[PDB]
Amino acid sequence: NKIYIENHDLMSKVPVIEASKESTRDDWAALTVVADLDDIEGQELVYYALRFRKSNDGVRLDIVHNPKDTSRSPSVLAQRLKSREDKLLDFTRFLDLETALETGEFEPDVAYDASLANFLASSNMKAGDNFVILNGRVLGPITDFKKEDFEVFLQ
């Protein structure tokens, strides 16, 4: 649990696709993708995670933006994505995601940026790293991994 418990601030601010009400408890699982969405390789991972969630409605997906470069507030992209949180399964096209990360004025959330900086240090992962956490299991860094590999780890 301890990852989930120590980080409630951050995890409360990130984009979340809730598992469906009409899925079962045996289907239910918790996927976190942590990705640098300034880079294609991070975006691509999230895209796959989205596609996976689209097919597997027992999963609760949330997405943590974890940029290597911090000159911009991490919280900007995270808010861009959080604003468009309902829309995320309507994506059909890698471009829909790019678009969603491309636009939206937001005021930096410092408390978010702090939360992130904890989460990283206490979870011994670095800024910029791409990884997934699946029901508590950290997998990464990811330096391939597509929606197959999500599927299998669910089994």
Numbering used by the authors: 673 to 815, 819 to 830
From the article:
UGGT acts as the gatekeeper in this system because this enzyme is capable of sensing the folding states of glycoproteins as potential substrates. UGGT only transfers monoglucose residues to incompletely folded glycoproteins. UGGT is a large enzyme, comprising approximately 1500 amino acid residues, which has been putatively divided into two regions: an N-terminal folding-sensor region, which accounts for approximately 80% of the enzyme and is not homologous with any known structures, and a C-terminal catalytic domain, which accounts for the remaining 20% of the enzyme and belongs to the glycosyltransferase 8 family. On the other hand, the folding-sensor region of UGGT was found to harbour three tandem Trx-like domains: Trx1 (residues 168–379), Trx2 (residues 467–624) and Trx3 (residues 671–831).
The final model of Form 1, refined to a resolution of 3.40 Å, had an Rwork of 23.5% and Rfree of 29.2%. The crystal belonged to space group I23 with six molecules per asymmetric unit. The structures of molecules A–F were highly similar to each other with an RMSD value of 0.11–0.37 Å for superimposed Cα atoms 94–155. Molecule A in the crystal structure, which had the lowest average B value, was used for the comparative analysis and will be primarily described hereafter. As expected from the bioinformatics analysis, the crystal structure displayed a typical Trx-like fold, i.e. a five-stranded β-sheet with a β1–β3–β2–β4–β5 arrangement surrounded by six α-helices. In the crystal structure, a part of β5–α6 loop (residues 816–818) was disordered. The C-terminal α6-containing segment showed a higher crystallographic B-factor (87.7 Å2) than the average value (79.7 Å2). The α6 helix was stabilized mainly through its hydrophobic surface, containing Phe820, Phe825, Phe828 and Leu829, which made contact with the hydrophobic patch, including Leu703 (β2), Leu717, Phe724 (α2), Val804, Leu806 (β4), Leu811 (β5) and Ile814 (β5–α6 loop) (right). The Trx3 domain possesses an extensive hydrophobic patch, which is covered by the flexible C-terminal helix and can participate in interactions with hydrophobic molecules. Moreover, we provided snapshots of the 3D structure of the third Trx-like domain, in which a putative substrate-binding hydrophobic patch is intramolecularly masked or involved in an intermolecular interaction, offering a key breakthrough toward understanding of the functional mechanisms of this ER folding-sensor enzyme.
